[PDB]
Amino acid sequence: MWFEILPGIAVMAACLFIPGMATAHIHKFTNGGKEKRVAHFSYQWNLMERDRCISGVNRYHVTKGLENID
Amino acid sequence: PFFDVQKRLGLDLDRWMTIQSAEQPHKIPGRCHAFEKEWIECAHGIGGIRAEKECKIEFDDFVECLLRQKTMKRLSAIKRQRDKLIKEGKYTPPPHHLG
Amino acid sequence: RGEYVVAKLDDLVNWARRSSLWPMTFGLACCAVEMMHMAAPRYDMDRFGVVFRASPRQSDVMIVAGTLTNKMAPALRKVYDQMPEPRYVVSMGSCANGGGYYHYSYSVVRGCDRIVPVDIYVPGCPPTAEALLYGILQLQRKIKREKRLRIWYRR
Amino acid sequence: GEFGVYLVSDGSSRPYRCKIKAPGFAHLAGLDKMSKGHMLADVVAIIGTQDIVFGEVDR
Amino acid sequence: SMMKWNRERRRLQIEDFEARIALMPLFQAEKDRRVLQMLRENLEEEAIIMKDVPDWKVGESVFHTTRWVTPMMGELYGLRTNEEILSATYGFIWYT
Amino acid sequence: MPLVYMNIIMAFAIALAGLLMYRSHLMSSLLCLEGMMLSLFIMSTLIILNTHFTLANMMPIILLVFAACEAALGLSLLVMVSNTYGTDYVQNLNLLQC
Amino acid sequence: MNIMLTLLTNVTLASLLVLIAFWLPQLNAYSEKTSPYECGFDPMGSARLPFSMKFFLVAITFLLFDLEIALLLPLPWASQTNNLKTMLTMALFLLILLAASLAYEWTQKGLEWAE
Amino acid sequence: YGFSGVMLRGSGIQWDLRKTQPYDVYDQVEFDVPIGSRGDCYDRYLCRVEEMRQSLRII
Amino acid sequence: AGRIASFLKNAWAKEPVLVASFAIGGLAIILPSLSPYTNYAIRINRATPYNYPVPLRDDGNMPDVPSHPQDPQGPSLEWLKNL
Amino acid sequence: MTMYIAFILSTIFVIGFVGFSSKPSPIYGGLGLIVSGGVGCGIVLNFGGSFLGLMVFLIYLGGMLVVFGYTTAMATEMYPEVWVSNKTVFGAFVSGLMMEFCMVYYALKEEEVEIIFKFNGLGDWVIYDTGDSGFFSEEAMGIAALYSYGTWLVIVTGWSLLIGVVVIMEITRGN
Amino acid sequence: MFMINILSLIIPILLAVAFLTLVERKVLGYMQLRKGPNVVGPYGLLQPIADALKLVTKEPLRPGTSSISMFIIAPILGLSLALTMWVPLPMPYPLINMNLGVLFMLAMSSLAVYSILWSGWASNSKYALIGALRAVAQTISYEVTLAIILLSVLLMNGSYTLSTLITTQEHIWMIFTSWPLAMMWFISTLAETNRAPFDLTEGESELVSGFNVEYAAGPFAMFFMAEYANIIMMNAFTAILFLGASHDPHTPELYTINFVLKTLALTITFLWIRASYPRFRYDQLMHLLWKSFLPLTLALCMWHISLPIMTASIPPQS
Amino acid sequence: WKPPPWNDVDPPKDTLVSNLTLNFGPQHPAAHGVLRLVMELSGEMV
Amino acid sequence: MELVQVLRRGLQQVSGHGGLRGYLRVLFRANDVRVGTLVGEDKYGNKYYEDNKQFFGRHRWVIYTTEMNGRDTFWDVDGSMVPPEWHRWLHCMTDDP
Ligand SMILES: COC1=C(OC)C(=O)C(C/C=C(\C)CC/C=C(\C)CC/C=C(\C)CC/C=C(\C)CC/C=C(/C)CC/C=C(/C)CC/C=C(\C)CC/C=C(\C)CC/C=C(\C)CCC=C(C)C)=C(C)C1=O
Ligand code: SF4
């Protein structure tokens, strides 16, 4: 007769749902759809900085491949 | 050491950490490895009293590399003079120096 | 209009106060046993928003359940003083109401009202847990009829 | 426990002296002997193992 | 199960590290060119800025030796803008 | 000889001054001692992180290691002065003067 | 950039909630209301006199025990070295010495609380 | 100490007024007195539960 | 057996947590020497490259050093791929 | 501004030092050391070190909790003192705060103070080194070498800790 | 929109904490054959809002013997740290991808005791000081095993970053590898959150209300905020550590749903054990650990130290 | 400055005990609300 | 199988109470959605239901009238709104309505 208990979790589940999606979506929105690149070590940060430099528009997520080179 | 038991037994207990040029983990170099190596190789066996007079500029370069203000004083006065003279319009920074 | 806004604020605040009445664990005598039986599964204070809580600092309503004697009256008055406002006193049982069986004794306060301002008088010896629940609901309606911000608006 | 009454009449229609022997009185009299070295939580356990009721104790 | 998965992860890490190794020389070349270019820019700026100074012979070395020293990050970005120094120094430490 | 070093050295100086001056209690002096230890840790960590002396990063850990040991021994001493004295103040600790 | 912005958000949200909690409810305070709570009757009078704690030995050795975990925690990075024999011997040395310390305390009353 | 009831039954003392000095018609019903063993709180609690069961038998 | 078995059984009866902790500790102490995979672990830690394999000047003689990463001569870690 | 960061955190470090060096009630001194240790961990974090700062955090919070637990037990009084209650603690706090105020005043304008040591205070960003740590944090490999290189340190530290427990036992024996 | 993320990690967490009270008073009540809150709207879905409104409009008295400053700074400390320790959790993608998330959360959990400490001491009460000292002993005892168990479990992770746990439990839950430690860990999560059967800091039966005894209205509601946010965060950390879940890089919502369900189940077990046990007696919960948890966890620490080496299964650090 | 004792031990000082004495009494849920248990206790051991 | 029937009778719950509007009416007023045979009604408007299948205590119940004696009782109700004749039947003091 505990189904009356179930709404309490339900809305609460929604509560615990809200951050986990939002951050992910934010990480996709602010970084051009792709996952936020994580720099756990200096090499990754150097790669990110070189990406920011090459992009020309000063955003690391903007990526250039074969079209950029001759 | 007072009673250097380490050389007598040929056992390493603290000599690995004494200097920055020793074998660091994963061969990570020190910030001033070259200067320390040059200074140490300079005054080895020569004597700890002859080291000050003979191996002087090596130790001076090493201590600079450690602390760096015959270079940072240079920078401080450079920045001071720049901010001074820019105030009343003698100099303007080039575009690559602000974006 | 300002009257409508303060009215709605009154309804909200009064609803909160009446829907989260936190009582105190101040059972004194046999009237406490019914005070437990309405906390028992059958009547279950909890569904009405009322949950027992000691440490008067975090309680609103005091159900004086049991005989209030001379040796205890200073403690009851002091403990009522600890309660931060708003505070309400529900008097359970004839003993806590006007004296009950031992109304003519030498060491019984002839009514809890002589020590604290009692808000709801619940009669019985002991009152049936249904009757005490009815008294609590009557106190709930009392809080519902409060007009604090209205009086402030007509200061 | 052993709940008792010492009822003393006088031949009239009302009692002359009704003393109430209460197990709770004697049990609470021995609370201190029980709680020796025991902590406060043990005292909480002990005043419960007597099923102490002060309606009967205070008469 | 953990043994097998950890061994596979070790193989994957070895592959990633060898990819980084294959790519490192280009990064080294680009980095040395960038630091040399920045030092050149700072020297040209210092030439103009240190002109009416009593005696500030520019391009002077501090260490008596001639072997190159890994330039301190202050003397690589001293005249650069605020965002440049903030991102260069407190860049990896602040990227969370 | 850079700036942050000045602040940590100055903090150690005030902690040394605070240790060398007692007012009432024994806990306060011990706290000032562990503050001296804190300043030492921060200074040494700054030095070795700056110099990339990778093999020497264990040195602040060993510092803290013996730090906690001395703090423990000092507060046990305070336990005994409280057991034989009721309190911890130092001005009443005078039985050895003669 | 991110971490102190976070910390600031939490502390200002908390300080705000405190402010609304402490300025809105229209408090009415008198002396007996703020009187200390001592299960009804007036307190004997203390609340700052020395309060004996019999686990003082246990409390202080917690400091050494928690201190050792500083030595212990570099293990996830220590396992990935080329000298696993020495690393294993030293890690087991730390753990064995902690076991010996705990056993010495256990046998020599130690962990048992004072009376 | 004047203890009675469970605190006697809980400490080995074989005493119960329902059996030793029967009153009303307690000399007819059949029940067992849960004599305790150690005299602690746990023994008295077990005694109380067993008294509940024996009273169920008497009911 | 006898005294030793009785002591083990009584310890299992009275304080099983201590028995379990001591057994786990002794196992974790003495097994790693016996197990043959330990050496493998070391080799894996040696296999993982963190720094660049800085090339050495080919002044001729040395045959073992490869002249190209794809060249067969030189250390190989097929064992790790299989294992 | 975010230019200095380390400077401001060092000032909070010194202020926390003044707080507990003024001999207040030991609980208040513990709080002052707590804020000082937190901001010191912040400084160590901002100086390219993560493990060391969090280690200071954890270890010092453990130690200061035990200091509190002893303070309200042994080293307490019927009238605990505040940084403003007594004139002596107020004087110590005033001396420390005005002192550090005038030290940082003489520091951040001239930026060439000689006091004890020559202190050219341009900026802490300057002294940073342009380097590459690859795929390993230098501090992590540094304190991870304790079990591989510093075996002697392992032995001496373990022996010291065990005998520290022994002495904590013997001192507190009380006959 | 980093501000957007920060607000999205606070308001939903506070709402979840609010509804935690309702689900507790319902699950507990249904354990005890009762019905729990049922009157306010449908199924009591308004009780958290109702008592939230009361606690912030009820008079927040300040005791005459209090120490004002710490009496106020303690609730702020508690709530701020309870909210802050949610930021490094690897809910699909952690908000703050720290390299030392485990150590950071240990540090803030150890700091959270100082809120209890200062609130208890500043209140100037016998019961409050008693509860503060019980908190001292409880949290030190359980913190030792917290640190050791975290080290032992993360030895298979390869580092202290929370995100890699998802990579670690790619094919199997970590509980199948360290189920003994997990048990101990769970108990520690029960005690560090100061919950049953170790909720002796409050001790409603013997300490009236413990360190909340002089805390009324807003500050009391705030300490309750800290306690329940810590409950949910601890259950989330336990779910992240042992009961890993599948994570599709393209649809993080799947991992969000699985993680949230696991946290909900762990919290429900928290309320379950809260309504099925008597309460420990101070020294026992110490003698439980210093004599039964500590030796076992030391032995398991040595076992998990040796285990990757004997099987050539040392996890990578990157 | 009287000379130190021959046994080099200062005589044991007077009693300095300040054991707590709280009202485990009315309004307490365990004390049934109508008890006043005045307990002279040292810390937790009564 | 019983899952489907259980989901189904939850729709008889809304069907019995005059559709969805009456369903929320009884849910928000009497806090229950259970249906029962209309045993009777009094002159004041209270409706009196019984369901012998329910366990002893909830086999009989009231939905109180919206209005009694010049007082809105749509939201606030009490146990004194029971007429004396029916107070016997409601409190299980008799089986004769
Ligand atoms: C032998 O003789 C005896 C006697 O003989 C005479 C006696 O007398 C007595 C004494 C008698 C008694 C003790 C009486 C009997 C008592 C009982 C039987 C006890 C019965 C108890 C119960 C039925 C209840 C038990 C409680 C339970 C099961 C659970 C309690 C738990 C809870 C969580 C309760 C709820 C409390 C709280 C604080 C939660 C609410 C708070 C919130 C939801 C806050 C939410 C806030 C927000 C959402 C804020 C949001 C903010 C946001 C979004 C932003 C903010 C930011 C801004 C900037 C503003 C005894 C014992 C006796 O033995
Ligand atoms: S009114 Fe009756 S039941 Fe209540 S305390 Fe008095 S005698 Fe007992």
Coordinates of all heavy atoms in Angstrom, one line a residue, chain M residues 8 42 48 52 57 70 84:
Chain M
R8 N -5.9 -1.7 -13.4 CA -7.2 -1.4 -13.8 C -8.1 -0.8 -12.7 O -8.7 0.2 -12.9 CB -7.9 -2.7 -14.3 CG -9.4 -2.6 -14.5 CD -10.1 -3.9 -14.0 NE -9.8 -5.0 -15.0 CZ -10.5 -5.3 -16.0 NH1 -11.6 -4.6 -16.3 NH2 -10.2 -6.3 -16.8
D42 N -27.7 12.3 5.3 CA -28.4 13.0 6.3 C -29.0 14.3 5.7 O -28.6 14.7 4.6 CB -27.5 13.3 7.5 CG -26.1 13.8 7.2 OD1 -26.0 14.3 6.0 OD2 -25.2 13.7 8.0
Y48 N -22.7 9.0 3.5 CA -22.3 7.9 4.5 C -22.2 6.6 3.8 O -23.2 6.0 3.3 CB -23.4 7.8 5.6 CG -23.4 9.0 6.5 CD1 -22.6 10.0 6.4 CD2 -24.2 8.9 7.6 CE1 -22.6 11.1 7.3 CE2 -24.2 10.0 8.5 CZ -23.4 11.0 8.4 OH -23.4 12.0 9.3
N52 N -17.9 -3.5 3.7 CA -17.6 -4.5 4.7 C -16.3 -5.2 4.4 O -15.7 -5.9 5.3 CB -18.7 -5.5 4.7 CG -19.6 -5.3 6.0 OD1 -19.4 -4.4 6.7 ND2 -20.5 -6.3 6.2
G57 N -12.7 -0.8 11.2 CA -12.2 0.5 11.5 C -12.4 1.4 10.3 O -12.7 2.6 10.5
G70 N -24.8 27.5 8.0 CA -24.2 28.8 7.7 C -22.7 28.8 7.9 O -22.1 29.8 8.4
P84 N -26.6 13.1 15.6 CA -26.6 12.1 16.6 C -27.2 10.7 16.2 O -26.7 9.7 16.7 CB -27.5 12.7 17.7 CG -27.5 14.2 17.4 CD -27.3 14.3 15.9

